[PDB]
Design a protein around this nucleic acid. Structure first.
Ligand SMILES: [Mg+2]
Ligand SMILES: [Mg+2]
Ligand SMILES: [Mg+2]
Ligand SMILES: [Mg+2]
Ligand SMILES: [Mg+2]
Ligand SMILES: [Mg+2]
Ligand SMILES: [Mg+2]
Ligand SMILES: [Mg+2]
Ligand SMILES: [Mg+2]
Ligand SMILES: [Mg+2]
Ligand SMILES: [Mg+2]
Ligand SMILES: [Mg+2]
Ligand SMILES: [Mg+2]
Ligand SMILES: [Mg+2]
Ligand SMILES: [Mg+2]
Ligand SMILES: [Mg+2]
Ligand SMILES: [Mg+2]
Ligand SMILES: [Mg+2]
Lengths: 65, 88, 70, 271, 100, 129
RNA sequence: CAAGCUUGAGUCUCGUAGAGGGGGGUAGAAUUCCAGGUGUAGCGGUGAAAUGCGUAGAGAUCUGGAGGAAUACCGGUGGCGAAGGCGGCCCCCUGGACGAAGACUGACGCUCAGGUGCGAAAGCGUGGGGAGCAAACAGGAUUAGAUACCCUGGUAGUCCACGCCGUAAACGAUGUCGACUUGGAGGUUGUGCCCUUGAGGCGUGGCUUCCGGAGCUAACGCGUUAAGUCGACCGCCUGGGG
């Protein structure tokens, strides 16, 4: 199934970057939920964390710096 | 936001019981305490036309509770407005 | 869309890999949609029809997947 | 606050008063007052050098401290007073040691605040410290041009100076005019922005309202005879000539700066 | 009495003074009657994009419980501290310890 | 909110018959039971029940003859917005007496035929045909 | 009128989801400009072209800097708000909604003429700011003309603070509040049981999308979020122009 974050019922943090790197493309764009399969409740948490990881320079804004 | 400590003090003050939350005096007292709290907010953020609309629901609701109390029991009305301070 | 050409291989396959990157990353399409400014109404209207006709295709499929034709 | 007067008289319709209730309503501080005599625009030769000056109301000079050469020793604001010689209100300041002084009043300074000067000072409005310690990109008034000179930039009501960059021993400043300058990094700079920013929104309203500020009437060149002004002449409102100053030099476009010794410090000219 | 998740980076040339700077920030909060729950010093890491320069950095994690006034004052100390770049402040989920 | 409970009782019955249901329920009152105690012996409705102790729920058992229903049409006349009282001499007649009209005389709730036979007039509650 | 009652209405406890509002900061991408380094003769634009920029060395490319505005991907017939409307991240002030289990007041209710408050965009006033777009305007084209569509430029304006303005196809062209009346396929947000067998299965709550039954009606169509069967108030309509 697409049960990845729905199994781990929690909040998604920005300091676990290995989990976050699964849900971004090669260029750094957030992957739409039509592909990953995560439900809408955790998509927003997953999206917000990435926007926090980018600020702390843990993830790249684009693939050209 | 009327933190639980402030709420729990007023109910025990005005209420007949320690669990008599919901009487007109304790409802009007809780509405009064929050309105006086919101004066310091709207005295600086004058362009909060959204939060002000929620304060006018508290002002009107308190007004309805006073009229019902006055029509029912005048003696209980005259003490409550005196303890709180309003109607002018 | 950075590509690193591997040990030799053919330049055509390296080119075909670079083209796939632009197709998959939407580099071509975003430039066209942002070349001119259309009003916010047109953006809301176009998404309305796009979703309505997408769902209408699904609702019109059930009227032909069981009805004999010839 | 600005208030519009009521049109009870023809000469009171168009009056806007800038009134601050916080100003001290009594007499100034006695030891910080000197005599100040008017001149009327006459130099030692007795001839009027600058025109349209004369009369007014008698004023007494107030010794406003510009250097602020007191490291440490924090001071408190006693009151804010009206200074006739300036556009900005002044502030009487009492130091913990005991001395009293007059300083310029920043916008965010009330009666009771604590300020000080020196490198050790903290970054708050009204405090003074050399540029090397002020963060780049800050708003600053009472800038010095030479270390120890005293302070000449951003002294009027509501003005300020931006610190754009820092290069070696020099600091680049964006001035209120629009100019960019390079002043030494060791010039002191009071931190903040000058107060009394309502000074603009003040219409005098009548002819005599400017006569008691010391401004005499201004006769236009076209209204004179040909001997008295290059415009002059005419039989029924003729001009026919390029505008000029009353001494022949051309106004309305012609530049006049010529220094050649301070052109090193001008990054870019006025916008 | 709020919870926070301060995370800031010191730029690597002054990374030798981080322990002598950590103690000062927790000195005020403890001195202002506030608790500290984590001190995860991530060490010298590498940015995903240069901060105008300076491809490396030195990361710190705090997770401090303190009154809001101290944190308001602690925020401006990071602003004027030259060695500190891109301070961050967060909120509740009170007690945490993970993700070194 | 609701300002007339009587038209509620009629509407529950009218909707029930049209929807072809067996029995309807509603909060009960002495006026609702009295009207039910009229339709029942006029043949329009079978037995009713007033079960309940603090929240009484008047239940009516509807009636049918064929694929169609019994109650042809039942409408409220003296609505709270406009109340109607009629004298004995000019009590109405529903379908030339084919149907019944419920009136509330000073002696109780009775059909218009039973009020003329008693010499009375009262508020006209409804026309049941 | 008096005394009750609990269903309507409301308060308290716990919790959840949100571009709901005000204020203050900080990022990264991109456009424009400025100062320089390489370097050549084209660049730009169109249906075609010309105006325009360029050997005074442009366009292209690299380094540094200054400014203003808006927030790619997430993004969704998704969410919130009375309506207008609301979209980077963080902070501190604040409103509303919903759900589980109970206590509490006990008709405290619905609608509302005159009033009062909010109210897109353009527009007005006084200060700022001005990158990009761009009414007006100028030139180049097409044209029989072209005060237009097309091209190269370009000021008010769009941005901020405080005041006016008070109108829109301000539109689900559908007033608010209650009651009842067969069904399906979904979206979003709570919850209490088993099979915490791990996915799951059983139901109950709140908003919301599409299709359709009776019924409604001029027909289109609406159809439990009615335009169906009904109650309580309010606003409006009475042939087309003028
Ligand atoms: Mg409340
Ligand atoms: Mg003049
Ligand atoms: Mg003459
Ligand atoms: Mg002459
Ligand atoms: Mg003449
Ligand atoms: Mg002439
Ligand atoms: Mg009205
Ligand atoms: Mg506007
Ligand atoms: Mg304007
Ligand atoms: Mg202007
Ligand atoms: Mg144009
Ligand atoms: Mg209208
Ligand atoms: Mg009109
Ligand atoms: Mg609209
Ligand atoms: Mg619409
Ligand atoms: Mg309309
Ligand atoms: Mg209303
Ligand atoms: Mg339908």
């Amino acid at each position: 199934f697409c049960r990845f974050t729905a199994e781990g019922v929690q909040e998604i943090d920005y300091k676990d970057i290995a989990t976050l790197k699964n849900y971004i493309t090669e260029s750094g764009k957030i992957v739409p939920s039509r592909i990953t399969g995560t439900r809408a409740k955790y998509q927003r948490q997953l999206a917000r964390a990435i926007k926090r990881a980018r600020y702390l320079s843990l993830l790249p804004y684009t693939d050209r710096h | 936001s009327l933190s639980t400590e402030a709420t729990a003090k007023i109910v025990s003050e005005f209420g007949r019981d320690a669990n008599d939350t919901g009487s007109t005096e304790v409802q009007v007292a809780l509405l009064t305490a929050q309105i006086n709290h919101l004066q310091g907010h709207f005295a600086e953020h004058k362009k909060d036309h959204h939060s002000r609309r929620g304060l006018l629901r508290m002002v009107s609701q308190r007004r309805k509770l006073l009229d019902y109390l006055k029509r029912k029991d005048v003696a209980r009305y005259t003490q409550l407005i005196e303890r709180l301070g309003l109607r002018r | 869309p950075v590509i690193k050409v591997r040990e030799n291989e053919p330049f055509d396959v390296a080119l075909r890999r670079f083209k796939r990157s632009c197709e998959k990353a939407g580099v071509l399409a975003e430039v066209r949609r942002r070349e001119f400014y259309e009003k916010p109404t047109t953006e809301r209207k176009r998404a309305k029809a796009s979703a309505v006709k997408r769902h209408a295709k699904k609702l019109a499929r059930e009227n032909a997947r069981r009805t004999r034709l010839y | 606050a600005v208030v519009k007067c009521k049109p009870t008289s023809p000469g009171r319709r168009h009056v806007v008063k800038v009134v601050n209730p916080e100003l001290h309503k009594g007499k100034p501080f006695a030891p910080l007052l000197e005599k100040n005599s008017k001149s009327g625009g006459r130099n030692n030769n007795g001839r009027i050098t600058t025109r349209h000056i004369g009369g007014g109301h008698k004023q007494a000079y107030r010794i406003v401290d510009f250097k602020r050469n007191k490291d440490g020793i924090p001071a408190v604001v006693e009151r804010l007073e009206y200074d006739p010689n300036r556009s900005a209100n002044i502030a009487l300041v009492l130091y913990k040691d005991g001395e009293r002084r007059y300083i310029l009043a920043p916008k965010g300074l009330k009666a009771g605040d604590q300020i000080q000067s020196g490198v050790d000072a903290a970054i708050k409005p009204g405090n003074t410290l050399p540029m090397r310690n002020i963060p780049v990109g800050s708003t600053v008034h009472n800038v010095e041009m030479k270390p120890g000179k005293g302070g000449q930039l951003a002294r009027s009501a509501g003005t300020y100076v931006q610190i754009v960059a820092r290069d070696g021993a020099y600091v680049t400043l964006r001035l209120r005019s629009g100019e960019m300058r390079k002043v030494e990094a060791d010039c002191r700079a009071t931190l903040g922005e000058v107060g009394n920013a309502e000074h603009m929104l003040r219409v005098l309203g009548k002819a005599g309202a400017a006569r008691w500020r010391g401004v005499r009437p201004t006769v236009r060149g076209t209204a004179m005879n040909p001997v008295d002004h290059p415009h002059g002449g005419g039989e029924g409102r003729n001009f026919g000539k390029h505008p000029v100053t009353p001494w022949g030099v051309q106004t309305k476009g012609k530049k006049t700066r010529s220094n050649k010794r301070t052109d090193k410090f001008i990054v870019r000219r006025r916008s | 009495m709020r919870h926070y998740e301060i995370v800031f980076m010191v730029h690597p040339d002054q990374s030798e003074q981080v322990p002598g700077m950590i103690e000062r920030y927790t000195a005020a909060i403890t001195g202002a009657e506030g608790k500290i729950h984590r001190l995860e010093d991530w060490g010298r890491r590498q940015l995903a994009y240069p901060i105008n320069k300076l491809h490396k950095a030195h990361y710190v994690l705090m997770n401090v419980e303190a009154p809001q006034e101290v944190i308001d004052e602690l925020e401006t100390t990071f602003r004027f501290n030259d060695a500190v770049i891109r301070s961050m402040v967060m909120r509740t989920k009170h007690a945490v310890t993970e993700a070194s | 909110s609701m300002q007339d409970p009587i038209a509620d009782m009629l509407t529950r019955i009218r909707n029930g018959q049209a929807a072809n249901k067996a029995a309807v329920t509603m909060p009960s009152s002495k006026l609702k039971v009295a009207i039910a105690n009229v339709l029942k012996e006029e043949g329009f409705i079978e037995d009713f029940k007033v079960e309940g102790d603090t929240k009484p729920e008047l239940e009516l058992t509807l009636k049918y003859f064929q694929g169609k229903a019994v109650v042809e049409s039942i409408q409220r006349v003296s609505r709270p917005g406009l109340r109607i009282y009629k004298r004995k001499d000019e009590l109405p007649k529903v379908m030339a007496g084919l149907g019944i009209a419920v009136v509330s005389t000073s002696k109780g709730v009775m059909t218009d035929r039973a009020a003329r036979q008693a010499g009375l007039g009262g508020e006209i509650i409804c026309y049941v045909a």
